[PDB]
Every structure is written in structure tokens, then in C-alpha cells.
Design a protein around this nucleic acid. Structure first.
Ligand SMILES: [Mg+2]
Ligand SMILES: [Mg+2]
Ligand SMILES: [Mg+2]
Ligand SMILES: [Mg+2]
Ligand SMILES: [Mg+2]
Ligand SMILES: [Mg+2]
Ligand SMILES: [Mg+2]
Ligand SMILES: [Mg+2]
Ligand SMILES: [Mg+2]
Ligand SMILES: [Mg+2]
Ligand SMILES: [Mg+2]
Ligand SMILES: [Mg+2]
Ligand SMILES: [Mg+2]
Ligand SMILES: [Mg+2]
Ligand SMILES: [Mg+2]
Ligand SMILES: [Mg+2]
Ligand SMILES: [Mg+2]
Ligand SMILES: [Mg+2]
Ligand SMILES: [Mg+2]
Ligand SMILES: [Mg+2]
Ligand SMILES: [Mg+2]
Ligand SMILES: [Mg+2]
Ligand SMILES: [Mg+2]
Ligand SMILES: [Mg+2]
Ligand SMILES: [Mg+2]
Ligand SMILES: [Mg+2]
Ligand SMILES: [Mg+2]
Lengths: 233, 196, 101, 121, 154, 84
RNA sequence: AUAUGAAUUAAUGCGAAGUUGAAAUACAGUUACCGUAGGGGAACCUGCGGUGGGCUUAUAAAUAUCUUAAAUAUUCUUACA
RNA sequence: UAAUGGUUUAAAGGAUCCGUAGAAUGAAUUAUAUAUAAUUUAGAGUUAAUAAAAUAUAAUUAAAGAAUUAUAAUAGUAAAGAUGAAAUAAUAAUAAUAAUUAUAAGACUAAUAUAUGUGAAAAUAUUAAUUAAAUAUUAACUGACAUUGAGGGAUUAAAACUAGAGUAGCGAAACGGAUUCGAUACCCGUGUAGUUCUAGUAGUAAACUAUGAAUACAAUUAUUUAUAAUAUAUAUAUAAAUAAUAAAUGAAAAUGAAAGUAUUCCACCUGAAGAGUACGUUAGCAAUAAUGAAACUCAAAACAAUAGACGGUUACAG
RNA sequence: UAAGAA
């Protein structure tokens, strides 16, 4: 769509109306818009750095800055055909944001597919209210999930307590297991202790599933019988 | 989604992540403060403010913004021609004289006064992509407008864009509540000086 | 609309504007120079307050299209001296305005 | 269209005004002898009995000339003077005879436009 | 090279139509002089040396090793929803080079059509080449210097 | 492979096919006639069918798709047309 | 070489009122047209290839899911925190 | 008194490419008066290496396959074939048609398949081989050697012609049967030329993308397509093509990386009709091809779109 | 110092 002119210049056209006398009374917005001008450039703006990983956008390494033989043993003595092509488009293409955590988020849930069955709430409470010390995994205001493992891993890396991401990730994994075993034992023992004092529950999870299966299976029986009778004819 | 990008919104974008474009929230904050100040200034001047949003669950926020700014809202449907054909559409509905304190005077209006166009001083649209008619009418009727500009929306169609997500009711209600509070503060200042 | 005018009598520079099939060539003129243009353009200039103007119409000479396209020529294909000066950050001086003080 | 093509002879066609009376040889008029007087039918939608005559000019060309005016006295072997100007509804007749010149008398009892019909005051 | 200057003029028009803030042009003495004249005349916001990938942050010295990958990066100006550099055209074309003396240059600056060249406009810049120096037409008139009338920019 | 279409004047199925549920009466009648063909006429081996037939045909002897609406409603949203 | 007459002779234009075919324009009732060949007084007919300036005019073989449903969400008017 | 033009559709892109002249145009830095000189590698090239089916294209040579027609048999019997329905001087009792075998000959190339692709265009898709060409990226090298291209050259569908072979199917012409008021047509039957091959001539097509070539540039999306990675996943980057578009252009239809922004070179156009005609010339065995007028007549003539009317126009309902 | 019309 053509860059529109008549939405951002309402003040100028209104002032022409007022000066000519076509409009008698000044509108209520007139002085407000006069004191707060709209942005009227509507330009494409280049970018020179990827915000996420800090990679510089728009630098060409020269042959002088590659004085050493490449992996195939050949020196670089002249520019290649990629260096000679103007790369202005990269300056305007919105950069792809990248985080190592995402590679480490994919791994965790490949190693623990049943951690995907733990429901997650994506509704944020307030990102500014978070004050976490990742020296430990449990945090007040957070659940225990894969992100706890990964944030602890990143903490361990940035403090150089481990040099390799693999070892930090494994350490975080074992702390996560330590906490999960405690939680599951807490749940089981809480239920056991509740039953030992006369807690009378109604439908459990197993009975819930049984009743839903029954609801589905009744309709399935009816359809099967109807289809068999129809097929016979 | 990056597949639905309107490239004229390039300068508002921070990057792409998970197959969608991320809006640069520093720019969103700057534009939002500018638009909020425009709303506050218009409410402080006693002008008419209209809140337009025609998506499903936006009625509550629009009504509350209107009621705390002493403004007006539409959420059902924007009748095309509501501004450029105001006589044929809005001419029949009733009008009212009010004092500096927004107190009904209960004066009897002439039929000629009742028949006049009463044009908004400010239009804020929460879903400008589905409200092109309103934007074009505001341009023709020369009404400054504010809108939430998503990655697929044309920025130049509004006077005061706010880059942001127009698809989430939480984001829309956050921005709308900010503008409504700015209008409320302008109204409170107007009443304060009119009580002094 | 509002039409930019140099000295409230002519157009700022020259205009070579195409509106559909109509090629307009307008040229600003000196004081006392008349409206030496197509008759449609003459009527528009009479209404707009343009007093001095030269010009020629090529290709289509449809009256409606001439009329409509001359107004886009006046509004879109003109830049005032102030706009140019502020855009370039330079001072544009009118030599005749300064010769007579 | 290119500069070298314009140099080689490309350009706007000349607005060359062709002669509509080639048989006069760029003369205001020529003397002639009427070979016959004809009565022709105009093209449609016009309907009339148009008075014309074939005339051989002094330069040898034989042309068809319309005889204007209400009544004429042209007859075979009459000396006439022929100027340009076609009769629009008679195809092939591209010349007019001059009333009041030669053996063709001016229109009888003409009041208006007498000079166009060879009539005295 | 007038062909490359024409390419640059057309490229500047193209970049102004889409409103890109920064673009690149070929790295040559004529291109650099032209860009500098535009920059000093207020048509460009910035002029930098750089590579095919972007403007140089720090000085990078140009040698035959990197000459083929050098570019000149120019920042375009926009104001009040209008480009500052709208039109940019050659006067002296590659197939018809127009060299004028100082008197005809004064006539052109005074409103006279010389050799079918439309005269200078109120907010227009006509550049002239003299002794392999690009310069403003009025400056050439002041220095009493005949030259090749090169391009208009408005 | 994905075959995207050009901008269409419409998105409509010419003759949408619907769920024609078979009449129970006709199925019962077919089963009863098969029974009489195999086990003889007025056989006692499927009197139940006869009873059921009598019970189902007693009062009455015989006992639309919305795809176009939703296609028209959603075509502009899903067609992936580039922005104006 | 060039002009001027020429018996005879080829083509073509126009006009008045008509006259005859049904070739084209719709699937124009045998798709039209380009090239080429034969036939025919001619309009046209037929053969061979090409083009769309005709078929993009394109539009389903159909079935869908489980957590605290409310003393709890739905209320909320710068409040609390 | 309009070229401050045009050429997809209104008049107008050359069939295509190669390339000579160009008094056409054309890179970079420095020095000295647009040139000279020395330097440079961004255009344009050369040679290798690596990857890929460079499979497709051209010529040549050698093969395969389904079917058709005719001939001979075998058994079997009265109709067969064609059409809207029929009828045909040459279907069948001289045993036909149909079936099953066996021989012979030509021409063609089912599926894959999209002409995707390859080729300058024309063309080109059953198989194999020989020869020739065509891809990308790296390495090294030359140092503007380039672009375009009047004239010229080469190739160039189908038809046509000259010789010599071949001729199963199809089939101009011709002869018959129908249909019809009439049939000179559509339909049916025999069927010559041609369609096939070899050596030529000829150089035209709606030879079309109705769109000349090259260069620089301009906002997106989606698909493939081909490489290069990185560990099926990066909804992976870099190219080309295709599809839908922004902007721009445009009489609009629409084009869309060109019908945009620019530059260079060439071809062509200047109302309709007369007319791609006449005359002349050149070439050709001819048919013809190329070049290509004027008089006469008129105020027309055309393109896109709009709304109807109409259609031996579609679909849906009632 | 460049005007169009039927
Ligand atoms: Mg949105
Ligand atoms: Mg008179
Ligand atoms: Mg017919
Ligand atoms: Mg027909
Ligand atoms: Mg015949
Ligand atoms: Mg072809
Ligand atoms: Mg048709
Ligand atoms: Mg069509
Ligand atoms: Mg002129
Ligand atoms: Mg035509
Ligand atoms: Mg044409
Ligand atoms: Mg071509
Ligand atoms: Mg042609
Ligand atoms: Mg095949
Ligand atoms: Mg060439
Ligand atoms: Mg063929
Ligand atoms: Mg042949
Ligand atoms: Mg032969
Ligand atoms: Mg044969
Ligand atoms: Mg046959
Ligand atoms: Mg017929
Ligand atoms: Mg026949
Ligand atoms: Mg040949
Ligand atoms: Mg021919
Ligand atoms: Mg031809
Ligand atoms: Mg055009
Ligand atoms: Mg000929």
C-alpha cells in the first residue's frame, strides 16, 4: 500500500481550513496535535547487530584479515563471489533471534518426553517482578520444570564452575531429579496419610478414566450394532 | 507470522523468533507514551474521544475506557459513513448541552443544533486492519487517530501508531487501559481547574 | 484544498506532471505575465488565485482529466521554498526579493 | 527512437497540407471550356439534383466543377473560370465555377452575399 | 564514467521511492565527488566508506586486495512525509555529452533553455565537471570555469 | 507437494455430499426378505424380525452440509493472499 | 534515355435503389485465424502444421477428545500490595 | 497550430542467433597535457580441480515395442461394415465379418509427463553407442580483450518443387453414396498427390511471450529447483524459475523483477481503403520470396473497458 | 517566452 499522506497531516489541512475561514472554530485536538507532532518519515532502517547473540551485521572480512591457510590448506588471496555481492538486504532483514538455551530446551524434552505432560501456563504474571538467584534450583514464584534445569545450567556456565555445557547440564539434571523424587514421595505419602485418617475421596483418576471410557464405549457399541445391521441388509 | 509481514512495518520490528516477528518494545513504549499524551491532551481540552474495537471480547475495556474518560465507544460494528455521512446515520440520535464540569444543563436544543454533525476529536482503534473504513473516514473527516499497529498493518494510515500485538485481549486491554488512564488524568485536571 | 503559491501569484518552479493520459507542462511566470494556458487550467487558476502562468498540455486533452490532474500537479508536484530549505538545511534566497531591499 | 536513428532520419511526420485542387497547378483559378453540363445525385442522406459540369482547363486537365447559385446559364462550349473548393455531397467534384466570370452570369436577383454570386449592387 | 553515474542516479531514485534510510553506490572518484557534493548541499544525511556488506565502523584502507569489495554508503533524508532527494537525472548523457562555456552556464542559471536543457529550478542542484572535479553550477560560474553539465538533482 | 490456488471469485463445493442415514425400516425389510428366501416363507426362525418390522413400520412405513457457509466465511482469512 | 498519343487490355474506387449466398461475430450451429496447397466464377470448401486472438470457463469420496463448574471463574473503578 | 512520441492488445520487435563497419556506446587508480603512459581487477574471457545423471540437445550408427493393413491357413455360419438414419459402379455363399495362428511391409513412439528441462530460434521425451556442445563452486591466469550491431552470414515448422527409393495407415484432387429447395459443403466409400527416407531447391507461419539485446537498480510472501553447510532438525543460508502481490507504470485490460526506475545499441510505426496490390529489380526449376508505390475515395478507422441485448451458452433451485 | 477547438 502506498505510504499515506493524509493521516499524519491532519493538522496542516485543518490549519488551511482555519486560515481560509472555511472552519470557524478550532477543534479541541488542534493545539494538542500541534504540540505533539506525528512521526512522518516511514523509512526502512538498517541494523548492524543481532540483538540476541551479539553477532555484527554488515561486516566483510578482508583477505588481509585471513592470512592463514583454510581447512583445505589454501590461502585466500582474492575475494570470492559472495564477498563481491552487495549485502544491503541483510541490513534491513529483521534478524533471527537465537539463544543457546533453545538448543538446551530441545534436549531436555527429548530426554524427558513425559515432562511435556506436565501442564505449563504461558500467561505471564509480571516479568519485572522476578528476582531469582540461580545458585539453587527451587525458586519462590516458579514451578519446577525444564526451565529450572536450563537456567541453573546457564548460571553454572556463567560462573565458570563448569567449563563444558554438558557437565553443567548434567549437574542441573541430577539436582532436578533430586527435587522431583522428593515431590513425588511427598504426594504419595500425603495421600497415604490422608487415607489413614479417614479421608473419603470420591472418584480418583483411574475411576475418572474408566467412566470417560464407558461414556465413549456406549456410543461406540450403538454405532457398531447399527453398522453391522446395515451391512447385513 | 513472518509469512504475513507488511514490510512497511520494518522499522518497528526487533527480530523474528519461532516463526513470528517480535515488536521492538522500546519503540512501542515511546509511541505509547506519545499517544497517551495525545489522549490526555484531548480529554483535558474537552474534546470527544471515540474508542473503536470490533473484535470479540473487547467490549468491557472499551466501555470502561469511555466511562472513565467521559468518552464514547463502539464495539459492535462501524457503520461505513459514520463520519462522512453523519447526517444519514448519527443525525437522529440525541445530543446534549453540558457545562465546564460536564454537568448536564438540560437546555432545549434547536432542531438545527440537533441535526449538526458531532465529529470525534480523537479516534482510537484497537484493530485497524479490520477497520479500514473508519481510518479512511477519519482521514477524510480530518480526525487524528491512534491505533495498535501489528506486523501486518499499515502504519501510515493513522496519525499516532502504537506498534503492538492487536490479536491478544491482554495486550490490547493493557494499552487501552493506559490510554484510558491518561484520558482520566486529563479530565481530572480539567475539572480541577474548573473548580478553582 | 490549499494550493502552494509563490508570491500568491504563480507556481514555485516548473511542473512536468502526468495524470493518466494528460501530460501537463506548467511554468512559473513573471509579474504582469498573464494566464497563458489551456482554458480549463485558466479557470482553475482564476479560482485558485494563480495570476501568472505559462504551460502546455500534451497527449490527452480531455477536459475532465486536465482539470483533475492540474490539481494534483499543484498540490503534489510543488515544494515551497521553506520545505526545500528545511529539508536540505540550507537557505534559499529569492534574488529579486532581496534586490528591492 | 535512438539518437543515431534520429540522426539517420527518424522524426515526427511533417504536417504537410496536401493540395485539394491539384488540377489548377497552384493557380487561384483557371479558365476552361465546359464539355457538358451534368445533373448529379448527392450522396445520402442528402437529396437534390445538383448542377455540375465537366470543364477542360487551359492546362489540359478535365475536371468536374459544381455550379453554385439558384440558376445557371452554363452550356456546352461556354467559357468558365474554375476555383478550388469541393462539393461535399458530390464525390468526384472538387472544384467550383465562378459566378459572374466568363460566360457564366451572376445569380439573378441575388440580394445577400452578392460578391459570392457575381451580382451587382 | 557517465554510465555508472546514471546507474547511481536511478538507484537513488529507487531507494527514495521505498524510503530506505541507507544505501550503497560504487566506490570511485566520480561517485565519491558526486556523493560529497550531495552531502554538502544537504541532500544526503551521511556519507561513509565501506564494503559490500555495510559501512565501515573504523577506517579500512583501500588496496587492490579489497578494491572490488568497496562501496560508498549514503544516508537518505526524508522530512514531512516527502523525500528530500526526489528526482536525480543526468543532463550530459553517455551518448550526448554536453559541454557548456561559462556564459551559457549563466544563461542556464538565469532561466534560458540552452541546448534543450531546461533551466535551473528554485530548489535544484545542477552539478558540473571541470578538470575531473564535480562542483555546483553556480560555483563554476563564480570561478569562471567552463565544463560539462553533468546532472540535476531535486 | 503444496498446490496453492490463485485468487478465486469464491470457494464453494458444487454438490456437497451429506450424511444420508439409511432408514431402519428398509434394512429390517431386507433382512426379513432374506430370511424368507433362505429359511422359507412364514418361517418361525425370524418371527422376531417380523415383529420388529411390524413395530417399526407401524405408524410410518418409512419410520444438509454447511461446508459452503464456512468456506465463504473463512476464505479471505486462510487464502494466504499477500497484503494490499 | 525521356516524354506524348494510342487500337486493345488488367486492376481498383465511388454512388442510387435494389439482387443474390449464409462465410464471420454466440459453441455463429463444421472453433476462428496465420502460412501453404488443391478445388470453385466468387462467397467459400478441403488437406498439412501452427496460434488462442476457445475452452485456467478451473471449485470435497464426507465422520474428532478426559479433571477439580464454582463457598473458587464470571463481580472488581487506582485499590491493594 | 503536439512527438517535452510510440511499437503486448490501437500502426509498429526483425523467425532466430552469429558477427563486419559504426564518422555507436562502454570498467578502476595515479601522472602529464578528450588522449597518452604506468598501474588495478569489479565486466569479459582461458585452463585446471572438485561435485553432479551435466540424463535432456545436435549428427551418426545400431536396436526395441504396442498396433494397423494385406496374404495364407484352421474351424465355424449368414450376414458384415458405416451412419443421425442410410446408401454406395469395386464387402460376403468364389464362405465373408468375428476368432486363433503364421508370414510381409511400412509408418509411429503408450505409461513416466510437467516440454520439467535441453536448444539461438525452428525444434526436441521408446532404447544403446560414437562424436560435439551445454552446469555450479573453488584455484590460478589475461587485464576491458566488452555491449550492441547497418550491410552480411548461418539455421529455419507446415505446405510446395526437382531426382531417386518407399508407400502400411492417413489423405488435398478426382469419382461415386447420402443430406438438401438446391450441395457446388459439412457426413459415408474408393482414393491420386502428399505425409516416409536419401541428395537438393526454397526462406516463408498467430516463425507468439503478438513483448529485440545488454547493463545497473527497486518492497514482500509462498512454492519448488540446484548448490553449500550445520547437527530427519536447523520451518537452515545462497542462487534460478514459478505463483500471488507492494510501489511504479499504464487508455485500461494488466505488467511486476518488466509493460517499473535508468543507461546503451539495433529493428520498426505515423488515418482507413487502394495494398502487401501494380510496375520494376534480385533470387529461385517452378510455386513463389524479398524489395515496395502512386492516383482515386472517405471522415472515418481501431484499442481497452462499461451497461445491456442476444447465444442451436453453463450450473443451481424452485 | 510555448493556450487550443469541432
Ligand atoms: Mg494482528
Ligand atoms: Mg451565404
Ligand atoms: Mg455461418
Ligand atoms: Mg463457423
Ligand atoms: Mg470441392
Ligand atoms: Mg510455434
Ligand atoms: Mg470464441
Ligand atoms: Mg479467454
Ligand atoms: Mg514542435
Ligand atoms: Mg487485431
Ligand atoms: Mg498491432
Ligand atoms: Mg521474437
Ligand atoms: Mg511479427
Ligand atoms: Mg510417451
Ligand atoms: Mg552480436
Ligand atoms: Mg511440429
Ligand atoms: Mg515435403
Ligand atoms: Mg520423387
Ligand atoms: Mg503413400
Ligand atoms: Mg480414408
Ligand atoms: Mg455452409
Ligand atoms: Mg472424402
Ligand atoms: Mg538451405
Ligand atoms: Mg508469403
Ligand atoms: Mg513475416
Ligand atoms: Mg504501452
Ligand atoms: Mg510478392
Amino acid at each position: 500500500m502506498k505510504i499515506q499522506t493524509n493521516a499524519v497531516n491532519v493538522l496542516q489541512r485543518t490549519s488551511a481550513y482555519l486560515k481560509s475561514g472555511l472552519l470557524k472554530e478550532t477543534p479541541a485536538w488542534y493545539n494538542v496535535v500541534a504540540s505533539i507532532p506525528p512521526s512522518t518519515k516511514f523509512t526502512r532502517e538498517p541494523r548492524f547487530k543481532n540483538p540476541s547473540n551479539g553477532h555484527i551485521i554488515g561486516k566483510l572480512v578482508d583477505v588481509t584479515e585471513q592470512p592463514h591457510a583454510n581447512n583445505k590448506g589454501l590461502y585466500k588471496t582474492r575475494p570470492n563471489s559472495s564477498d563481491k555481492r552487495v549485502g544491503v538486504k541483510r541490513l534491513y532483514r529483521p534478524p533471527k533471534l537465537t539463544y543457546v538455551e533453545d538448543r538446551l530446551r530441545s534436549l531436555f524434552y527429548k530426554q524427558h518426553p513425559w515432562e511435556l505432560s506436565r501442564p505449563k501456563i504461558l500467561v505471564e504474571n509480571e516479568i519485572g517482578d522476578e528476582n531469582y538467584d540461580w545458585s539453587h534450583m527451587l525458586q519462590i514464584g516458579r514451578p519446577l520444570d525444564g526451565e529450572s534445569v536450563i537456567q541453573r545450567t546457564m548460571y553454572l556456565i556463567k560462573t565458570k564452575q563448569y567449563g563444558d555445557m554438558v557437565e553443567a547440564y548434567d549437574h542441573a539434571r541430577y539436582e532436578f531429579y533430586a527435587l522431583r523424587m522428593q515431590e513425588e514421595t511427598e504426594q504419595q505419602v500425603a495421600l497415604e496419610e490422608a487415607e489413614m485418617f479417614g479421608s473419603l475421596f470420591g472418584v480418583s483418576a483411574i475411576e475418572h478414566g474408566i467412566q470417560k471410557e464407558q461414556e465413549v464405549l456406549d456410543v461406540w457399541e450403538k454405532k457398531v450394532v447399527e453398522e453391522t445391521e446395515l451391512m447385513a441388509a | 507470522s513472518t509469512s504475513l509481514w507488511r514490510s512497511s512495518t520494518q522499522s518497528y520490528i526487533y527480530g523474528e523468533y519461532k516463526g513470528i516477528h517480535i515488536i521492538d518494545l522500546n519503540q512501542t513504549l515511546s509511541y505509547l507514551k506519545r499517544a497517551a499524551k495525545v489522549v490526555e491532551g484531548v480529554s483535558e481540552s474537552g474534546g470527544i474521544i471515540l474508542f473503536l474495537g470490533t473484535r470479540q471480547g473487547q467490549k468491557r475495556g472499551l466501555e470502561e475506557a469511555a466511562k472513565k474518560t467521559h468518552g464514547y465507544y463502539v464495539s459492535t460494528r462501524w457503520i461505513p459513513g459514520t463520519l462522512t455521512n453523519s447526517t444519514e446515520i448519527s443525525g437522529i440520535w440525541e445530543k446534549q448541552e453540558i457545562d465546564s464540569n460536564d454537568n448536564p444543563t438540560e437546555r432545549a436544543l434547536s432542531p438545527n443544533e440537533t441535526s449538526k454533525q458531532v465529529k470525534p476529536d480523537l479516534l482510537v482503534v484497537l484493530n485497524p486492519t479490520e477497520n479500514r473504513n473508519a481510518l479512511l473516514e477519519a482521514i477524510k473527516s480530518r480526525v487524528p487517530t491512534i491505533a495498535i499497529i501489528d506486523t501486518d498493518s499499515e502504519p501510515s494510515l493513522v496519525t499516532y501508531p502504537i506498534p503492538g500485538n492487536d490479536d491478544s485481549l491482554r495486550s490490547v486491554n493493557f494499552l487501552l487501559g493506559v490510554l484510558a488512564r491518561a484520558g482520566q488524568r486529563g479530565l481530572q485536571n480539567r475539572l480541577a481547574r474548573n473548580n478553582e | 484544498k490549499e494550493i502552494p503559491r509563490y508570491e500568491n501569484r504563480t507556481i514555485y518552479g516548473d511542473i512536468d506532471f502526468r495524470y493518466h493520459g494528460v501530460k501537463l507542462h506548467l511554468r512559473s511566470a513573471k509579474p504582469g505575465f498573464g494566464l497563458r494556458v489551456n482554458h480549463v487550467i485558466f479557470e482553475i487558476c482564476e479560482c485558485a488565485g494563480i495570476k501568472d502562468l505559462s504551460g502546455k498540455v500534451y497527449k490527452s486533452r480531455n477536459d475532465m482529466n486536465i482539470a483533475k490532474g492540474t490539481i494534483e500537479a499543484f498540490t503534489k508536484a510543488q515544494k515551497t521554498l521553506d520545505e526545500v530549505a528545511l529539508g536540505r538545511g540550507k537557505k534559499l534566497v529569492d534574488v529579486r526579493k532581496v534586490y528591492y531591499s | 527512437a535512438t539518437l543515431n536513428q534520429i540522426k539517420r532520419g527518424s522524426g515526427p511526420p511533417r504536417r504537410k497540407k496536401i493540395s485539394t485542387a491539384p488540377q489548377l497547378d497552384q493557380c487561384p483559378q483557371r479558365k476552361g471550356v465546359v464539355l457538358r453540363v451534368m445533373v448529379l445525385k448527392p450522396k445520402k442522406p442528402n437529396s437534390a439534383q445538383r448542377k455540375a459540369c465537366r470543364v477542360r482547363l487551359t492546362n489540359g486537365n478535365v475536371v468536374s466543377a459544381y455550379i453554385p447559385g439558384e440558376g445557371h446559364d452554363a452550356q456546352e462550349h461556354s467559357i468558365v473560370y474554375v476555383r478550388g473548393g469541393r462539393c461535399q455531397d458530390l464525390p468526384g467534384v472538387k472544384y467550383h465555377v465562378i459566378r459572374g466570370a466568363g460566360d457564366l452570369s451572376g445569380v439573378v436577383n441575388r440580394i445577400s452575399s452578392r460578391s459570392k454570386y457575381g451580382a451587382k449592387k | 564514467s557517465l554510465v555508472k553515474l546514471a546507474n547511481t542516479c536511478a538507484h537513488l531514485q529507487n531507494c527514495s521511492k521505498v524510503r530506505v534510510a541507507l544505501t550503497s553506490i560504487p566506490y570511485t572518484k566520480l561517485q565519491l565527488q558526486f556523493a560529497y557534493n550531495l552531502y554538502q548541499q544537504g541532500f544526503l544525511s551521511s556519507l561513509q566508506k565501506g564494503s559490500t556488506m555495510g559501512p565501515d565502523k573504523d577506517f579500512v584502507e583501500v588496496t587492490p586486495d579489497n578494491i572490488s569489495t568497496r562501496r560508498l554508503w549514503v544516508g537518505l533524508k526524508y522530512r514531512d512525509n516527502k523525500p528530500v532527494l526526489s528526482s536525480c537525472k543526468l543532463i550530459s548523457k553517455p551518448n550526448s555529452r554536453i559541454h557548456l562555456p561559462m556564459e551559457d552556464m549563466k544563461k542556464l542559471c538565469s532561466g534560458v533553455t540552452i541546448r534543450n536543457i531546461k533551466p535551473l529550478q528554485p530548489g535544484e542542484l545542477i552539478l558540473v565537471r571541470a578538470h575531473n572535479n564535480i562542483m555546483d553550477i553556480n560555483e563554476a560560474i563564480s570561478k569562471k570555469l567552463d565544463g560539462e553539465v553533468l546532472c540535476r538533482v531535486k | 507437494p503444496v498446490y496453492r490456488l490463485p485468487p478465486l471469485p469464491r470457494l464453494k463445493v458444487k454438490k456437497p455430499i451429506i450424511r444420508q442415514e439409511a432408514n431402519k425400516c428398509l434394512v429390517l425389510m431386507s433382512n426379513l426378505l432374506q430370511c424368507w428366501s433362505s429359511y422359507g416363507h412364514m418361517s418361525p426362525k425370524c418371527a422376531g424380525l417380523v415383529t420388529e418390522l411390524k413395530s417399526c413400520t407401524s405408524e410410518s412405513a418409512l419410520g444438509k452440509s454447511n461446508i459452503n457457509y464456512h468456506a465463504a466465511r473463512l476464505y479471505d482469512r486462510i487464502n494466504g493472499k499477500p497484503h494490499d
